[PDB]
Every structure is written in C-alpha cells, then in structure tokens.
Design an enzyme around this catalytic site. Sequence first.
Site, PDB file in Angstrom:
ATOM      1  N   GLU A 164       0.924  -1.174  -0.161  1.00 20.66           N
ATOM      2  CA  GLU A 164      -0.082  -0.055   0.093  1.00 20.66           C
ATOM      3  C   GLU A 164       1.077   1.212  -0.067  1.00 20.66           C
ATOM      4  O   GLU A 164       0.626   2.320  -0.650  1.00 20.66           O
ATOM      5  CB  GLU A 164      -0.947   0.017   1.192  1.00 20.66           C
ATOM      6  CG  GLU A 164      -2.064   1.267   1.154  1.00 20.66           C
ATOM      7  CD  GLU A 164      -2.909   0.911   2.494  1.00 20.66           C
ATOM      8  OE1 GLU A 164      -2.873  -0.312   3.020  1.00 20.66           O
ATOM      9  OE2 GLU A 164      -3.468   1.777   2.641  1.00 20.66           O
ATOM     10  N   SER A 212     -10.698   4.628   5.688  1.00 23.42           N
ATOM     11  CA  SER A 212     -11.288   4.018   6.800  1.00 23.42           C
ATOM     12  C   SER A 212     -10.468   4.494   8.208  1.00 23.42           C
ATOM     13  O   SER A 212     -11.161   5.127   9.240  1.00 23.42           O
ATOM     14  CB  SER A 212     -11.190   2.577   6.667  1.00 23.42           C
ATOM     15  OG  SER A 212     -12.154   2.282   5.530  1.00 23.42           O
ATOM     16  N   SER A 238      -3.479   7.172   7.690  1.00 23.48           N
ATOM     17  CA  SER A 238      -2.102   6.742   7.827  1.00 23.48           C
ATOM     18  C   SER A 238      -1.251   7.908   7.490  1.00 23.48           C
ATOM     19  O   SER A 238      -1.716   8.945   6.424  1.00 23.48           O
ATOM     20  CB  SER A 238      -1.696   5.647   6.786  1.00 23.48           C
ATOM     21  OG  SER A 238      -2.251   4.419   7.271  1.00 23.48           O
ATOM     22  N   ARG A 245       6.403   5.151   7.004  1.00 25.67           N
ATOM     23  CA  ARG A 245       5.039   5.388   7.697  1.00 25.67           C
ATOM     24  C   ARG A 245       5.362   6.058   9.096  1.00 25.67           C
ATOM     25  O   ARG A 245       5.801   5.127   9.890  1.00 25.67           O
ATOM     26  CB  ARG A 245       4.168   4.084   7.792  1.00 25.67           C
ATOM     27  CG  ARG A 245       2.717   4.524   8.102  1.00 25.67           C
ATOM     28  CD  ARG A 245       1.760   2.916   8.380  1.00 25.67           C
ATOM     29  NE  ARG A 245       0.577   3.373   8.725  1.00 25.67           N
ATOM     30  CZ  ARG A 245       0.059   3.094   9.789  1.00 25.67           C
ATOM     31  NH1 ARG A 245       0.761   2.682  10.683  1.00 25.67           N
ATOM     32  NH2 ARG A 245      -1.312   3.291   9.858  1.00 25.67           N
TER      33      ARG A 245
HETATM   34  N1  LIG Z   1     -19.334   6.428  -1.811  1.00 27.00           N
HETATM   35  C1  LIG Z   1     -18.653   6.544  -0.479  1.00 27.00           C
HETATM   36  N2  LIG Z   1     -18.986   5.530   0.355  1.00 27.00           N
HETATM   37  C2  LIG Z   1     -18.203   5.290   1.458  1.00 27.00           C
HETATM   38  N3  LIG Z   1     -17.504   6.023   1.942  1.00 27.00           N
HETATM   39  C3  LIG Z   1     -17.145   7.287   1.305  1.00 27.00           C
HETATM   40  C4  LIG Z   1     -17.771   7.484   0.045  1.00 27.00           C
HETATM   41  N4  LIG Z   1     -17.499   8.388  -0.444  1.00 27.00           N
HETATM   42  C5  LIG Z   1     -16.307   9.063   0.403  1.00 27.00           C
HETATM   43  N5  LIG Z   1     -16.290   8.261   1.465  1.00 27.00           N
HETATM   44  C6  LIG Z   1     -15.237   8.484   2.809  1.00 27.00           C
HETATM   45  O1  LIG Z   1     -14.113   7.938   2.280  1.00 27.00           O
HETATM   46  C7  LIG Z   1     -13.730   6.964   3.353  1.00 27.00           C
HETATM   47  C8  LIG Z   1     -12.907   5.829   2.601  1.00 27.00           C
HETATM   48  O2  LIG Z   1     -11.924   6.497   1.937  1.00 27.00           O
HETATM   49  P1  LIG Z   1     -10.626   5.477   1.198  1.00 27.00           P
HETATM   50  O3  LIG Z   1      -9.615   6.164   1.096  1.00 27.00           O
HETATM   51  O4  LIG Z   1     -11.281   4.857   0.066  1.00 27.00           O
HETATM   52  O5  LIG Z   1     -10.483   4.323   2.005  1.00 27.00           O
HETATM   53  P2  LIG Z   1     -10.098   2.448   2.336  1.00 27.00           P
HETATM   54  O6  LIG Z   1      -8.837   2.507   1.552  1.00 27.00           O
HETATM   55  O7  LIG Z   1     -11.186   1.912   1.372  1.00 27.00           O
HETATM   56  N6  LIG Z   1      -9.926   2.056   3.790  1.00 27.00           N
HETATM   57  P3  LIG Z   1      -8.306   1.745   4.266  1.00 27.00           P
HETATM   58  O8  LIG Z   1      -8.278   0.121   3.745  1.00 27.00           O
HETATM   59  O9  LIG Z   1      -8.050   1.978   5.569  1.00 27.00           O
HETATM   60  O10 LIG Z   1      -7.404   2.371   3.224  1.00 27.00           O
HETATM   61  C9  LIG Z   1     -14.913   6.651   3.850  1.00 27.00           C
HETATM   62  O11 LIG Z   1     -14.772   6.039   5.391  1.00 27.00           O
HETATM   63  C10 LIG Z   1     -15.907   7.776   3.823  1.00 27.00           C
HETATM   64  O12 LIG Z   1     -15.636   8.654   5.198  1.00 27.00           O
HETATM   65  C1  LIG Z   2      -3.470   1.618   5.917  1.00 31.58           C
HETATM   66  C2  LIG Z   2      -2.751   0.709   7.188  1.00 31.58           C
HETATM   67  S1  LIG Z   2      -4.347  -0.214   7.704  1.00 31.58           S
HETATM   68  O1  LIG Z   2      -4.946  -1.265   6.738  1.00 31.58           O
HETATM   69  O2  LIG Z   2      -4.064  -1.260   8.798  1.00 31.58           O
HETATM   70  N1  LIG Z   2      -5.749   0.674   8.489  1.00 31.58           N
HETATM   71  C3  LIG Z   2      -5.250   1.655   9.696  1.00 31.58           C
HETATM   72  C4  LIG Z   2      -5.562   2.936   9.652  1.00 31.58           C
HETATM   73  C5  LIG Z   2      -5.462   3.891  10.656  1.00 31.58           C
HETATM   74  C6  LIG Z   2      -4.688   3.298  11.611  1.00 31.58           C
HETATM   75  C7  LIG Z   2      -4.079   2.033  11.770  1.00 31.58           C
HETATM   76  C8  LIG Z   2      -3.308   1.412  13.223  1.00 31.58           C
HETATM   77  C9  LIG Z   2      -2.323   2.333  13.272  1.00 31.58           C
HETATM   78  O3  LIG Z   2      -1.686   2.573  12.627  1.00 31.58           O
HETATM   79  N2  LIG Z   2      -1.604   2.110  14.866  1.00 31.58           N
HETATM   80  C10 LIG Z   2      -0.218   2.757  15.330  1.00 31.58           C
HETATM   81  C11 LIG Z   2      -0.575   3.983  16.221  1.00 31.58           C
HETATM   82  N3  LIG Z   2      -1.559   3.439  17.556  1.00 31.58           N
HETATM   83  C12 LIG Z   2      -1.236   3.667  18.653  1.00 31.58           C
HETATM   84  C13 LIG Z   2      -2.056   3.721  19.727  1.00 31.58           C
HETATM   85  C14 LIG Z   2      -1.885   4.038  20.948  1.00 31.58           C
HETATM   86  C15 LIG Z   2      -0.636   4.430  21.395  1.00 31.58           C
HETATM   87 CL1  LIG Z   2       0.016   4.731  22.910  1.00 31.58          CL
HETATM   88  N4  LIG Z   2       0.332   4.566  20.327  1.00 31.58           N
HETATM   89  N5  LIG Z   2       0.235   4.156  19.020  1.00 31.58           N
HETATM   90  C16 LIG Z   2      -2.728   2.686  16.783  1.00 31.58           C
HETATM   91  C17 LIG Z   2      -2.260   1.484  15.996  1.00 31.58           C
HETATM   92  C18 LIG Z   2      -4.727   1.223  10.918  1.00 31.58           C
HETATM   93 MG   LIG Z   3      -6.803   2.968   1.399  1.00 33.49          MG
END
Ligand SMILES: Nc1ncnc2c1ncn2[C@@H]1O[C@H](COP(=O)(O)OP(=O)(O)NP(=O)(O)O)[C@@H](O)[C@H]1O
Ligand SMILES: CCS(=O)(=O)Nc1cccc(CC(=O)N2CCN(c3ccc(Cl)nn3)CC2)c1
Ligand SMILES: [Mg+2]
Lengths: 352, 352
Positions: free
Chosen positions: B121, B175, B178, B190
Amino acid sequence: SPWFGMDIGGTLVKLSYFEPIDITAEEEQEEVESLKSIRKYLTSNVAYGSTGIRDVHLELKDLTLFGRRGNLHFIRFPTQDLPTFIQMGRDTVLCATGGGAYKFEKDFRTIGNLHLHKLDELDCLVKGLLYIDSVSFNGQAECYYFANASEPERCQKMPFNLDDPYPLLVVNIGSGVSILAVHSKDNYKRVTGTSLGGGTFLGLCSLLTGCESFEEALEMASKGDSTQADKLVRDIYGGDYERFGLPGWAVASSFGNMIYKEKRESVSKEDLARATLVTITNNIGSVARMCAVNEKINRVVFVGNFLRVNTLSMKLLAYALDYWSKGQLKALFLEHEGYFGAVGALLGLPNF
Amino acid sequence: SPWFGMDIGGTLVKLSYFEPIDITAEEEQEEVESLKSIRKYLTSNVAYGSTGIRDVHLELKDLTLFGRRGNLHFIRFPTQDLPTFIQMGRDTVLCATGGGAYKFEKDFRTIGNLHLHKLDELDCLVKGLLYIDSVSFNGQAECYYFANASEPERCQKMPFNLDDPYPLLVVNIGSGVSILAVHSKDNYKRVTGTSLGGGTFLGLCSLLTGCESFEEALEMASKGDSTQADKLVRDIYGGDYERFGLPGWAVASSFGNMIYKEKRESVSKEDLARATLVTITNNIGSVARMCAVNEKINRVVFVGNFLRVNTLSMKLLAYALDYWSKGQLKALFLEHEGYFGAVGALLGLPNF
Ligand SMILES: Nc1ncnc2c1ncn2[C@@H]1O[C@H](COP(=O)(O)OP(=O)(O)NP(=O)(O)O)[C@@H](O)[C@H]1O
Ligand SMILES: CCS(=O)(=O)Nc1cccc(CC(=O)N2CCN(c3ccc(Cl)nn3)CC2)c1
Ligand SMILES: [Mg+2]
Ligand SMILES: Nc1ncnc2c1ncn2[C@@H]1O[C@H](COP(=O)(O)OP(=O)(O)NP(=O)(O)O)[C@@H](O)[C@H]1O
Ligand SMILES: CCS(=O)(=O)Nc1cccc(CC(=O)N2CCN(c3ccc(Cl)nn3)CC2)c1
Ligand SMILES: [Mg+2]
C-alpha cells in the site's frame, strides 16, 4: 478564615481543605462560630448536599502546612451545582484556579468581603503535583505504574519514585486534554491539547447508550466488546499488517464497522460504551506518545478525573504506551489524580 | 489483457483502467471479443451495476503509458460488492494493493488463469502520487491549496507546484488515517496512524443521525451547528484563554455539552453530524501538525476519499493547519485523492 483551594473546571469543582488539628484552647474560643460550623460540617459529613462528595481515602493526615499541623481533605462536586455552593456561602481569601475562576469571578464576589485571587491552571497543577509527591501519600508513594502491562497475568500496580521528577510530561485528562512539558520547578510549558477527552467519552456515551452517570458508563464498558463496533486490522487484511508491524487486533477504524446497517442493529449499548472508552483512551495515548517523542521525555504521567475509578483506561494506557513505544515510554499515574490544581491554588495562599 | 490497477481498501475499491486509443486496424481484429466487451462496457457506461461509478471528471486523456497513448479512467465501488465484481469476471494480470489484496487473494484466484500480484500500500501510494503530479491533470496542476484560509472572504482554491516534491508528509484519510514521511522517491516511511478517520465519521454519524450515505452525512453537517454539541473554551472560561493563546471559539471538549440531558434533547441531528465531522477533521489536522513538526516537514498533503465532495473538511484542514502552526505549515490537496494506490499498482505492471 478557612484554608481552601479550589479548581473550578468545565465539569467538576475540586476543593482542597486544610483542617487544623493543633488548635489550642485559646484559639478555640477566638474561633468564630461560623468557623466551627464549617469545620464541623466538612469533617462530620462525607456527602454534602446531593452532589458533593469527600474522597476520604485520599486524605493526607498530620501534614505540616504553613507552620501548622493538620489534615488535607479533598472534595468534589459538579460545576453545574456551583450556584448552590455560592448560595450556601452567602447565608475569607479564596485562591481559585481553572476556567471557572474567571467565568464565575463576579459570582464569588457576591459573598461579602470575600477576596478572590485567580491563579493560573498550569502553575497550580505543577506546584500541586510536585508538592503531593514530595510529602508522600501518608508515607506511601504518590506515583504508581502498572508493571508488566504487556502480560495480563503479571500486570500489577507498583509504586514509582519521582524524587528527581524532571523531565516530566503531564497529560491532564479533564473535559478536554492538556499536555504539559515540565523541565524544572519553574520551567514548564503547555505542549498542545486535544478536545477529545473525558467530556467526549461521557457526551458520546450518553448519546449512544443513554447512560446517566460516569460510573454507569464505565460499568457498561466493562461488559462490552469494542470489536463489535470497531473495524480491526484483520477486518481489512485478513490478518496482521506485518510490513508496518501492525497486529490483527489493532483498531484500524474506530466505529468503522458501524457503517454497515446490519452491524448497527446487532451492536449492544455495552459494546458502544466500550468502543467509546477505547477510542478516546487510545487516541489520548497515541497523542501522549507523539508529544513524548518530540519533547524527548520518557516519563508520561496522567492526571485528571477521567481516570478515577477507571482501571480499564489506566490499563489500556499502560499497555498501549509500553507496546507502541517498544518499551521506551512509561505510563505513570498518581493517587490524587484530579486534585493537584486545587492543591496548587491552596499553596498560593501565602502570596496574598 | 486489459491494463488494470486495483486498490481494495477497507471501505471502497478503487480501480484505474488504461484505455488504449492508438489501436491499429490489425490490433482490433486480433483483439478478443471479451477485450472489446470490457472496453465497451467501461467506456460506454458511467454507472456499473447499482454501486459502481466512474469519476469521468478525473479522466486523464492522451497519456503515454508503457509506450502507448490512451486514456486513464478512475472507477470506484464499495468493497462490500467485490464478490459481485469477481462473479462478473468468472462469467489477465491484476496488480492489486490495499488490505483487500491479501484478504481476497483466494477469491481472485477463482478467475481461471488470473495472475494476482500483491503490491504494498505504501509503495503504490507514493509512486502513484508522484506519477499523477508529474503528468499533470490534463495540463492543469494536480496539487492545489486554499489561499488565505484565515480569511473567508479571500479563501479560494489555488494551484500548487510540486516539481520538487521532497520532503512531503502524506496524510491518507481512508477508513483510518495513515501518515507517511516522503524524503525521496525511494526513501519513505510510515510515521504513525490513528484509527479516527473517515470510517469513524461515517460510523458515528450513522449511529447518531441515522444517515444512509456519506453524501447525506455531509449534507446534514452543512446544515448543522457543531457548537450545540461541543463545549468551547468560552463555555469554561467565559472568554479566551489568552495565557496559552486559545480563542474562545476553540473547542475544549468535543461533544462535551452532551453530558447535560437538556442539551441532548435540544441538539438536532444536523448538529451532531457537523460535530462528528468537525471532531474527526480537527483531530486529524492536529495529528498531522504534530507529525509535521517532529518530521520537520512543512508541506502536508491530504489524500483518501474522506475529503471527496467534502469541501468543509478541506477548508477546516486548511484553516486549522495555517492558524495553529502560525503560518509555517501548508495544507495541500490533490484532485485524484483516493486513486493514487490504484495508479501505483497499475505502474507495477512492467515488473511482471
Ligand atoms: N461513496 C462512499 N461510500 C463510503 N465512503 C465514502 C464514500 N465517498 C467518500 N467516502 C469517505 O471516504 C472514506 C474511505 O476512503 P478510502 O481512501 O477509499 O479508504 P479505504 O482505502 O477503503 N480504507 P483503508 O483500507 O483503511 O485504506 C470513507 O470512510 C468515507 O468517510
Ligand atoms: C493503512 C493501514 S491499515 O489497513 O492497517 N488501517 C489503519 C488505519 C489507521 C490506523 C491504523 C493502526 C495504526 O496505525 N496504529 C499505530 C498507532 N497506534 C497507537 C495507539 C496508542 C499508542 Cl500509545 N500508540 N500508538 C494505533 C495503531 C490502521
Ligand atoms: Mg486505502
Ligand atoms: N462524578 C463525575 N461526574 C462527571 N464526570 C466525571 C465524574 N467522575 C469522573 N469523571 C470524568 O472526569 C472528567 C472530568 O475530569 P476533570 O479533571 O475534573 O475536568 P475539568 O477540570 O472539570 N474540565 P477542564 O476545565 O477542561 O479541566 C469527566 O469528563 C468524566 O469523564
Ligand atoms: C485546559 C485548557 S481549556 O480550558 O481551554 N480546555 C481544553 C482542553 C483540551 C484542548 C483545548 C484546546 C487546545 O488546546 N487546542 C490546541 C490544539 N488544537 C489544534 C487543532 C487543529 C490543529 Cl491543525 N492544530 N491544533 C485545538 C485547540 C482546550
Ligand atoms: Mg481541570
């Protein structure tokens, strides 16, 4: 005049009262009847009105303050009930801190001949924390930590020494969160703050679960499963994201599973309470770790009343700060969590 | 074989498709009928099924990729509907990234003779971002910022140049969130992440307001007043906390006013939608500022789909990052917010 220290926060009013115990027979006669009534009322009762509570277990006994021996008492009541407190007083030098010292300044002046000295929230917190730790908790350590927070069968409360406190990162979790860097007794600064604090937990939990008290919200959270509302790393990857050292149990999106209608209908209000607590607590721990690394401080102490009778957030903060920092940061806690500002205010009395 | 790039996230699947436009008369005959059917289906329709959408406005026209000229298309649909996508295919080398590339790996193999190459990713996002910015948005700037975000009468969208992109802080709001530090084309890491992202906004807004779409939640938030649910600095002090430079309008406790039953009964669901958006957006901006200071990077670019058709969060991020950093940090945005991972995946095709 009675020796009071008051911290009027956005949610709770914290009051520290020094009860003299070395009163001579001459001083008793010269004592006005009002002084005898208030000392009796505060020491003969543990519940004041319908919302005031004296935390008797926190009392510091036989303390030498301002040249006299006495007992230090700790009392709290909701800021919403401060007009009642002021009305009882209308029917003395008061050192007050917190935001309410400014907001309710004119209200305190309604008490005839009352002298109100507003002290800063930062100065009282630092001076109060360092003082309580210096005089100990009746011989016991004021500061404690959770040893072996990584392993539940070994996680136990253990004392911690702060005889050389600096440097120190203070995370004040009240209605919001304030983060302070303490480099010396006179060199301290507010690093930053976040609005996601105890008020966010209580406010969201009331909207989601209909809880009617902070204690009821914690009891709901103890019976809940936050994974029913949170989307985890394994929900997105099917396992651990080992490329960036993220375990499958780590939360990827707080309340992320609530975007699906079928899971909103299946989630229990106990689950939502736990998810709210976990979300707020984890975010505070992550922000605390980020400030600690940037300020280059390895001891992070948590204060405020969000952590009172709240062992889950304490254990969550202890485990999170130890795991994610890979053992380089230490989560510390203090027995007199929410009263340091009130103590620091009382310690400003000789300055007036 | 068609040239696809897929980013299967926790919420949305993002697909980038390169449509050849320099097809010779000989290549048309040698083209299999399936290749003609898919190219027709994707180019003759803007809505695929009931949940697939082609963002036509983002299309890059007459792009030279892999030695051929063509159009780059951008398509999205919910990850929940991926089984339908796979079933349509069962009745080709696919470079896929995101968590779903691993979770649904076995599902993709149900397509006979399909070659699935899972790409990381992080690599796809960086390579996709740098590529789209290099080839421009049909001659227009891919990167833009909100000039004079401190003053609303002057706040306007303006292009921004990234011909020398490094250093760069990327805040991927999906969701979750990052945060990446990009120091060179091959040196990126990251920094951290927070679970309070777009899924938290959509999940909480669904619980609080009963909204049934991301667009409906934004429309509710546009009509709401977040101060009806948030406790502000002036609610605690009566004004500004000038000792620490905190204005009265600043939020002290998100959802903090919801601890009072009378305000929970008075708050509108539009107010709760706005408060949810503000809380999530402000926390992301504060975390982004903290990472930028620690990483010593002044350009912070925001990607992900949380910001699509979401000007309020963009303006909120632009104003917050400029005000709280006192003008030293710059909030940057990209026209192809949520598709960089899918583009980076497609760019890994020559490696197989
Ligand atoms: N049509 C839609 N449906 C759902 N969410 C949407 C939509 N359009 C915008 N969003 C927003 O965009 C966010 C998701 O963005 P996105 O970058 O595509 O994440 P993701 O890659 O699917 N999740 P992740 O695996 O953590 O990267 C959702 O949580 C909503 O807040
Ligand atoms: C795209 C990668 S994903 O698919 O896995 N989704 C995803 C999106 C956002 C955050 C995360 C989880 C993450 O990054 N963490 C590191 C930092 N955290 C903490 C929490 C408490 C403390 Cl004291 N210190 N550090 C919490 C865990 C995952
Ligand atoms: Mg994504
Ligand atoms: N009896 C209680 N009533 C309300 N909240 C409680 C209670 N006990 C613990 N808490 C928690 O403690 C938090 C308030 O802690 P506290 O340190 O006293 O803040 P405050 O000083 O009043 N607000 P602030 O002005 O921002 O400092 C609340 O938001 C709750 O999460
Ligand atoms: C005890 C002091 S109190 O009484 O005023 N309560 C209180 C409790 C917690 C937080 C706050 C407000 C605060 O500290 N802020 C500084 C950091 N912020 C941001 C937000 C976005 C960005 Cl990009 N950068 N920075 C938000 C504003 C107040
Ligand atoms: Mg306070």
